[PDB]
Amino acid sequence: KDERAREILRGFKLNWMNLRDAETGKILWQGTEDLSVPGVEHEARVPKKILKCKAVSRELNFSSTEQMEKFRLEQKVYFKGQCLEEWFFEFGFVIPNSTNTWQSLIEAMMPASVLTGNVIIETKFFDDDLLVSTSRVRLFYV
């Protein structure tokens, strides 16, 4: 289990990520940094108006050398160490040596001036019941 988790991680790469306004389709944020990498506190600077969005459409582009049965994410939104939201997203079967674009809808308030730099998204990378990695991104609302 521990060796299999390391094998998946060594062959996994997040190529890019975008955030779109679900109604207009306009990109609010886009990045090329691999935010999935564990042990490093990543940072993202998003427009403060994202908090006014009813729904946000996220696209994740990832590559994986290893086959996966049920690639899925558990995400917790922490504000000053307090969990505000818990999200669950399921991709499913990952064909070995493939690159995939995964689209997910995130549905929605505290002011941006307080949230900025104080919000952490904790992402747990799972294949079925196997925890592959845990990564974190600190959010800035500017």
Next chain:
Amino acid sequence: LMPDSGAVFTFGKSKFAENNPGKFWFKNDVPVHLSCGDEHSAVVTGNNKLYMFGSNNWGQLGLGSKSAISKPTCVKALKPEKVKLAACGRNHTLVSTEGGNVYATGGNNEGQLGLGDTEERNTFHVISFFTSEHKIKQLSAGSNTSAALTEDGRLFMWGDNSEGQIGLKNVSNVCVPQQVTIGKPVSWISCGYYHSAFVTTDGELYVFGEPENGKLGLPNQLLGNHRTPQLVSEIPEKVIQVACGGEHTVVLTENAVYTFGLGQFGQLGLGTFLFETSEPKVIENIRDQTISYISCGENHTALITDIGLMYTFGDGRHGKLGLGLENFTNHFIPTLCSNFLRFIVKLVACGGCHMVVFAAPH
């Protein structure tokens, strides 16, 4: 080593490799203009060359891609042109040339590139409106907003107007330069994130944009008219410079420095527990100190003194205040950059998570 003319110093997140100490210069060339956006930076040199670095996620560096950049990079495409000025917004860059051409690259969601559309670009595209007739004195750019100020005092703005931040009244946005006039020559322009301000030749300050957090410096009864430029009459003395940040504004007069808006990180410089003000307040701490230049980041501020010393205040994250390598604390009063005490600070620009300084040693 470093030439007698000095070096460019970077603080905070410039996205350089490691290491890469955060200091550079140019062979037989000198920096003449600095600009910083939310996550990127521009350096214009005396040989009329343009160097870009920082984030390239929207193609705001104009290098022909959206790939990561980890060092100052010369814009090859603009080499036939004589680059004079640059402005960096949230996700876009504006450039003006001596021959009369103005160029733009990067994000374009609200028409901030001035190209007549909303499609993002990764190379510098000419804005056809501007010709050799328009002698550009100053460029400015905020969050999806753009501005150009000419030598004879005409102001042109474009991009987002959803909160009145480009002063075009009822219009939601424009994708081409539009003139903003109150019937007076404009001497200074600053585009903040969601608000903008200009100074007239007779020393009057005009503000417009999002009527939130007190950043316009206007009394309550005038906040409804935020979509058109309005006079800040509460400042009695003649205004010389204005710098607009994320949620705050900084004003230089021939008597004092004024700040207003949000200051939860110390960016107002008005003391440890003064978190905000809706009316302009004098920074009393530097009342005896003459200030020659003001610069505004998203949530920090820099001031160059009469003799080329620098004071900074605001959010200290990643060392962007330029005070110490180990210090990342927020500063609520203007604090001397003692690391530059043996230096003349000649140019400064403040971004979202970084600051760029041109300084020369004694």
